[PDB]
Symmetry: C3
Amino acid sequence: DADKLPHTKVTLVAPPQVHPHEQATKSGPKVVEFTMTIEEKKMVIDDKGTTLQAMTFNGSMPGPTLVVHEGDYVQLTLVNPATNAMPHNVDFHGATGALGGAKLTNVNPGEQATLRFKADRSGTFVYHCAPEGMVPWHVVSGMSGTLMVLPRDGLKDPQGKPLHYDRAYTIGEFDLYIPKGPDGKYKDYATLAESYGDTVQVMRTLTPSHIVFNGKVGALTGANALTAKVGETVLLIHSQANRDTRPHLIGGFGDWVWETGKFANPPQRDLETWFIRGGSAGAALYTFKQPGVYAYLNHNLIEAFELGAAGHIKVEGKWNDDLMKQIKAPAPIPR
Amino acid sequence: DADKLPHTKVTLVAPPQVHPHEQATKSGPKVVEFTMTIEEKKMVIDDKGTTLQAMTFNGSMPGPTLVVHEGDYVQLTLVNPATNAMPHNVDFHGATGALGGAKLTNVNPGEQATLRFKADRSGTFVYHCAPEGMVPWHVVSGMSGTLMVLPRDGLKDPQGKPLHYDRAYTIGEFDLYIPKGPDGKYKDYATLAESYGDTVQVMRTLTPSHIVFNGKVGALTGANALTAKVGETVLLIHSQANRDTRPHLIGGFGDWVWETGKFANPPQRDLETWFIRGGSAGAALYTFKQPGVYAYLNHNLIEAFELGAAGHIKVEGKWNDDLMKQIKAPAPIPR
Amino acid sequence: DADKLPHTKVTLVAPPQVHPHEQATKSGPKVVEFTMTIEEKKMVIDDKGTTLQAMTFNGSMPGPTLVVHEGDYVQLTLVNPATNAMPHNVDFHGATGALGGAKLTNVNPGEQATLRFKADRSGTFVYHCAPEGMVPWHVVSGMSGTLMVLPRDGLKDPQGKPLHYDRAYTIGEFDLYIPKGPDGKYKDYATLAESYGDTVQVMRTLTPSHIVFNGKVGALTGANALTAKVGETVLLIHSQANRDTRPHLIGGFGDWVWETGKFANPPQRDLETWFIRGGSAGAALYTFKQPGVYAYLNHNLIEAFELGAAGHIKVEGKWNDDLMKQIKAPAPIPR
Ligand SMILES: [Cu+2]
Ligand SMILES: [Cu+2]
Ligand SMILES: [Cu+2]
Ligand SMILES: [Cu+2]
Ligand SMILES: [Cu+2]
Ligand SMILES: [Cu+2]
Ligand SMILES: [Zn+2]
Ligand SMILES: [Zn+2]
Ligand SMILES: [Zn+2]
Ligand SMILES: [Zn+2]
Ligand SMILES: [Zn+2]
Ligand SMILES: [Zn+2]
């Protein structure tokens, strides 16, 4: 049983990167040890200075992605420093019992706890905070991320053939509910607690003020664009802990997609747009064949371009005229 | 043909239970006879006394689940007593022709009708009222339920192996559109007809005031929690006749899920959250492995916790530390 | 390579028809040449005279469906006449690179351009306009349609058996965001440009004023109902370039459905309601077995009946009492 196995300790890395790991492995099961520390902080979430009284695992939206293999045990130490105001906990969708671990990880400021569970199902799974009586607030304020449980022999196509990625990225998409005052301007709160009531009223409308990748409008653009090269297969992990989304790569595809995120199921191929149910993480593979700056976005184009749910992927390599060619550049219409 | 076969008569039971039935059967096709009686009534739908001018099959939201086997004929007598104000009918998504039967079951108050159709496709299917010119109102006011057509040889996994459940529950999720007056308080109407215009205006906003399981906030909690035991496989049938939802079991999984609800298709496994398209019923199996009180909810957590789309499942049995263990209880952070 | 192959020229036809084409073909790859001309125009979109400052490919919402076979090259000439006010382009979800072709087809009024790309994946794919900085506006104002890339050997069921349709229809579903003035009446704009700011404010609410098939409430009803006969298999192509939808045939099924729209994946069978992710096109086959007027609709019934997302299919042939029979017509309840 779990008390017999070797332990490993993993150092997490900040999104959109994912900590180094193997896909197919000859390793046997391990107890894999992680630690996360909660940070409440005010964050600027758009280009005009709007702030969110935010709550995070490890300082980031999303929290870092934790990667283990099927049959491993996840052993998380969750730290709630005294510098925080609220209690927190963690609910792993990949875990069985005790409301995902929530019932066993209730940490007031100044406390920590350690949870172990068996990661017995392969897939990308949401984890999120879920304190009794204030679950949606802690989720929408930023407290979610992904646990990826890889099959021990790596990813497989519908015919059981091997699949792999060369590079992985993790995108958390956050529907935010920022209140406005009578002047129509977004409210700025001195403390987390003061934002609560007004935010619940906005939540209940079901209309986000902003929908952002990785914590801010344009998080994944400019200097912070994702990167790849022609010939590389990228895994795009997409989590939405509260609300549906519909990822899409402009000028690309989901070559192999697990939209419900569970790797024991066959993936679908050649997707234009896939669907991440609120409360889940999904996974897409794409092998770049053309260089250029791509957009990766939620294809409700209002959600993407107006509300913030879009990033960029800058891809190096050589252009392929067989795949696409400008035959006649824009030029006057003929007489 | 159908005029040759034996008839059976089934007595329906109220949600969340489902009438006794076999899964795999050695029985041949039958004409299976059901009756439902429509009841219009005012219902209290939340903890603060809000009322809905509701419309129901058999007095309940959802209507009872009807269970037959593929190749059976469903023979429904639909009774509209004179104590009701409106005309009604029934549209079975499992039926072929005549707008699901709607065109053939138009019953004014004081009338009844009898419809037969062949249940030639396996699956969970929505049925709902659909009177010409007032379809959405009758649906959102409570007039829907599920027909479950089981394959004759029972449920199968993607490899054709047998699946089964030990206990079945039926959950209908209702997006409600209750109007408010100028004081911001929900309106209470003396009659069904008086609620119509105001309700259509709320409907057109696409924002529900409440989203409830089985007719009321907290319907499936406390004394009315669903129940199971460690080692039991439960089937959770989930219908949403008007609007999408995303079911999830906190601390569990969808072990095998037909999210589109059609059993001739292979199920997906190991789901964290699945998706019920508005206008459909889906089905999930889960074998409990840990005792405790679970939540079963729509994982738009605002919809669940603010608006009402959540229930509880209380599960007896022994805790399994291999699956999950508290390694260190919440305790002060060390120096 | 592509410079070697034969060229063909296709004449497009207006929705809901689809230009003649073969399914399974013994033909080898071709460069298939199409032309589309953009028309900006004011259109009446409902029964009370509401107008949309609309943008279209070829004068229609949706644009025409383009049909090729896997391994063909699509060669589109896109014409933006001088009679238009805005620049436009095209983003084909079926194409690889250059933001779907958008970067290579930027045409100001009075200009045209010609794009070739390899249609290397089978499926129904959205194409839409995507001018830098005004993508959602051009999409929601009507600038989308479908490219259908058929497998060279035709459609296949999950076991590799042949499937086919006898008749194809193309339905584009449009979430519209028409502004109102202080009097609560929809605004009418003298020019396209004047509609922009007010429309963006409505877009940002995420609540459509109207949701229509093929450009107008009731587009596909009355004289313009779709038609079929008992024994015919119809393909229903359903595109939604911006927002999710949930198609359903009342009194029918999706016999075989590719809801994500990609034919190399196995279809699901016996669907009651399927799901088209915003930003995608899907495809359903249904073989009619009963005559009558069907409804084909988005099964958010508010979206369908209140907001406009419904059409009719009028089906000729003989009634089948084995499939459905009125056993007792509506009649008084007995003493
Ligand atoms: Cu928290
Ligand atoms: Cu959860
Ligand atoms: Cu009714
Ligand atoms: Cu229906
Ligand atoms: Cu345009
Ligand atoms: Cu697109
Ligand atoms: Zn140990
Ligand atoms: Zn590779
Ligand atoms: Zn008989
Ligand atoms: Zn059992
Ligand atoms: Zn040539
Ligand atoms: Zn045919």
